[PDB]
Point group: D2
Chain length 252, copies 4
């Protein structure tokens, strides 16, 4: 039977490109989403029209809280309920906004919980449930960030979250290797910029990229995910592949 | 007059060595602690006997919660209320225990303790530190990281994530606070003082792995690096993390 | 027509797997070799049998010397002479032996072999590659996942491989505006040396988290292939470890 | 008796600050130099005037060649011959100039950039260690905070410095059992010459988060002194950046 993947925040942009390419490759997918219900359900309908009963949606807030463990356990469960298995987990869902150390109107506790939750704690709880329920080509891939060591100004909690994700990637690769589960990452630099991003705001970041002076397409990021879930990456674990067009190599 | 430092989890071991060496260099210290009240107060007594009105304690749980911002603000406030200033912050307090992904604390609690103490508390401490400064000294922060974060212990995933996060704060905060004159750096031990309840056989197993001396670092050795980072000899150093590991991270499996 | 690749030290083991997998995907290959002439020609014969006029050999010492630039120029030239083009360069050739700091080769020779093959040849090859330029041009450098946790007494090897990391980054940066991508593949324990004891091979194997076994040469070639493919067209400056978790294990 | 250090390229700028600062802490210094004879001798004079018989000069080209091993052995010998001991070695001498991949020859570009930044440091380390085979022995290597985000067209330089990182780790590992520590100090922008363009110097200074300015040579030397000091007795294989946050700034 066909394998199954969970992709978090999979309704739009890069998560969608991931889920669609996995689907194109023959996976059944669970499309996790948070606020993007229309796009999530429109996407699962598109994929089910191509192959009946191959896409399902699952809503969940991945903000850290007393209930996050249960939410993540449920996301994994949806995959098993629908498809009877879970072969792959893509941690793509991520909050990203500035959190100045020195003075949007959220509280710091809410900043902490949204940035560290989505980027690190949820990934960890998802990995925990993924692993527990494995009772093959099993693997996890985490959406990281090529610029963690040269981070954006005032994005300390985001950056802290992505660095945590790299440590989860290494820690989880180490511990789950004996269960046959590989754990790896893909680290974009500038990929899709918000549709909002005034077309010349984009170019300020686009002009910085040595390979092409353009952002990555979502499909280019997904290509790396697909490679890491594939049988061509069977020996690869604990690895994080940057797909940044050289941007992290560019000095100030 | 004399500058002041906040040292978290300062009641024993490495934190204590840091607070003692900073005191010996002329700092007034706030000795934060969580459960170690008798050691915290015994230490402040010793330092105030050496120089009156130079050491104060501050109890606070740094587990993550909706009140942790408030606790961290208070820690900083206790330094200003005692000493009228806060010149350095050492983020040393840290929970450390295994959190297996698979095969009595709840995971919510495992998360809140390991991520709180190792990362979120340091972030919040740093925010309160920075907000309380003026907008005229050698202001800096030092974070106690971990040399082994890229080759971590088996089943310590939450701890490791906390330390990696600390690394990212170090960088992020160095970048953001450099314009305020506030340097931010790290010291990354390997094996320093060891558990109370591990056998000499297991302590010897870790010791044998250290290329420089086949021995763990003394707490004073770690403190030496902190002192360097706070000193005027490191005034251009920010965003840097100094490993003090006797080569242990260079040893392959 | 078909693209062409240069693969250094391609006569056996990992370089052979790279050149065969490249050939299997439709590339014409230059099989560079140094001492392994019988295996080089035997491989080019096997590939030309499968597809006539698709494999050629090229002998060259990649020890550092004042003629090394010329050797590396010739390697690239062989590719253009045979196939009219050069689309891919795989820097696989490498010397590897201990060079203790507290000690039959002289140190001048240890330096020239370990630094030349693992770093300066690669640099010179990439220069020649670049100067000689629809397409998907890229370079893949064979690095080593253990550079930060190196073997005892292999300082010149390790320096070579760390230098290869730097070329990777520096070349990626500089050649990106010419459309040329530059990336690496960093094995841990892959094929073991035939002169190793089976007992000492097993000791390294038992260290690998993922399978307690060394990588096959094919498994390394897979990652090279990915990097040269159209699926990696935004990837440059990147080095992919293929080590089964070996570098994440503490002492 | 006072300890002795060798500092390479010590006639001017950062090497000079290192030597001066070591001298100020009670070391006898061997001031190595290449072309800067008048500054080397003028410095040794100043230091000897302060404390008689505590500074000596030693000329050597550190470009890679057949004779580099010998030259590096002599540099170490000059310290033993003058002072009867050698306790620290600072590898500061370095060539730095562009080497585009697309008036010197490439063979000479290779020998100067890789020799000064890497191979000489290795050979010095080898001689240092062999001559040893209370006491605080260490080596400190001048690295470069920007090796992972290198300057455009400085391939060979960057390869050199990455190599130096590798030697640092490899030597730390191998020499730790002899009690010899090996560490590095990684500047970002420190002294920029007043001959370099005010616009281009301003671009660089404006990029530094901490102060919008270059490090003084003395600030770099401070980090060297820390690492040689008894306050760094457990530190080995570590490289300390002294870059004012410059390497944390994205493009
Ligand atoms: N685009 C880039 O240049 C770039 C660069 C570096 C790294 N990355 C990484 O690549 C990934 C994908 O990037 P993207 O730009 O496609 O991401 P994005 O659009 O900003 O976010 C992806 C998804 O995250 C979900 N999300 C946000 N908050 C959530 C919450 N509290 N709970 C559950 N889900 C939540 C959203 O779901 P809903 O809309 O359904 O609410 C969203 O569709 C992320 O991991 C990101 O950090 C991207
Ligand atoms: N020892 C080592 O080999 C080693 C190795 C690598 C890195 N490090 C790093 O070096 C630092 C110091 O190490 P160490 O061994 O001295 O540390 P430790 O003894 O394990 O912990 C130091 C203190 O942290 C405080 N702490 C724990 N949980 C807390 C909480 N929830 N709220 C507030 N405080 C809490 C405790 O204070 P109370 O006792 O008062 O409760 C404890 O005494 C740590 O940052 C560590 O991660 C140490
Ligand atoms: N095998 C591993 O576990 C492993 C681990 C980490 C990294 N790697 C890296 O992966 C790549 C291939 O590894 P491998 O194990 O296949 O390597 P290998 O067999 O040791 O080397 C491949 C070829 O290197 C060539 N070579 C050696 N000295 C040369 C010289 N002076 N001039 C020109 N060519 C020379 C040889 O060519 P000839 O026989 O024709 O003379 C040899 O067949 C290398 O870059 C290696 O450093 C391998
Ligand atoms: N200044 C900076 O912003 C900066 C930034 C990053 C890293 N660094 C690193 O820090 C160190 C000191 O830098 P700096 O700028 O003071 O250095 P520098 O002026 O460029 O060079 C230092 C000395 O190296 C010696 N040297 C050059 N070529 C040589 C050769 N072929 N043989 C022997 N010696 C040779 C020269 O000595 P003679 O004058 O006697 O010929 C020179 O005075 C270097 O390791 C450097 O790469 C500096
Ligand atoms: N790094 C990152 N992380 C998230 N979650 N979202 C985004 N969106 C980018 C601004 C387009 N980027
Ligand atoms: N917080 C922390 N971090 C590490 N690595 N080790 C320790 N060890 C102490 C015995 C508890 N504590
Ligand atoms: N060139 C190279 N590099 C490594 N790491 N390993 C090997 N193994 C070959 C059998 C010696 N070769
Ligand atoms: N990185 C480096 N290395 C050397 N030797 N010299 C320099 N000089 C810079 C122009 C001040 N930079």
């Amino acid at each position: 039977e066909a394998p199954a993947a969970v992709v978090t925040g999979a309704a739009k942009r890069i998560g969608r490109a991931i889920a669609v390419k996995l689907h194109q490759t023959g996976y059944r997918v669970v499309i996790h989403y948070h606020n993007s219900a229309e796009a999530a359900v429109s996407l699962a309908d598109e994929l089910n029209k191509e192959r009946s009963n191959t896409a399902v949606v699952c809503q969940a807030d991945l903000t850290n809280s007393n209930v996050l463990p249960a939410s993540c356990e449920e996301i994994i469960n949806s995959c098993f309920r629908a498809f009877g298995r879970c072969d792959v987990l893509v941690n793509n869902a991520s909050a990203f906004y500035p959190t100045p150390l020195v003075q949007n109107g959220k509280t710091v506790e809410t900043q902490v919980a949204e940035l560290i939750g989505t980027n690190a704690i949820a990934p960890f709880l998802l990995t925990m449930s993924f692993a527990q329920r494995q009772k093959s080509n099993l693997s996890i891939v985490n959406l990281c960030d090529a610029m963690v060591d040269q981070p954006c100004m005032a994005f300390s909690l985001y950056n802290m979250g992505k660095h945590a994700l790299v440590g989860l990637t290494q820690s989880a690769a180490l511990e789950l290797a004996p269960y046959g589960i590989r754990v790896n990452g893909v680290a974009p630099g500038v990929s899709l910029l918000p549709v909002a991003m005034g077309e010349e705001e984009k170019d300020k970041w686009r002009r910085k990229v040595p390979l092409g002076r353009r952002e990555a397409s979502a499909e280019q990021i997904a290509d790396a995910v697909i490679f890491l879930v594939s049988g061509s990456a069977q020996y690869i674990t604990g690895s994080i592949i940057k797909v940044d067009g050289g941007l992290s190599l560019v000095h100030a």
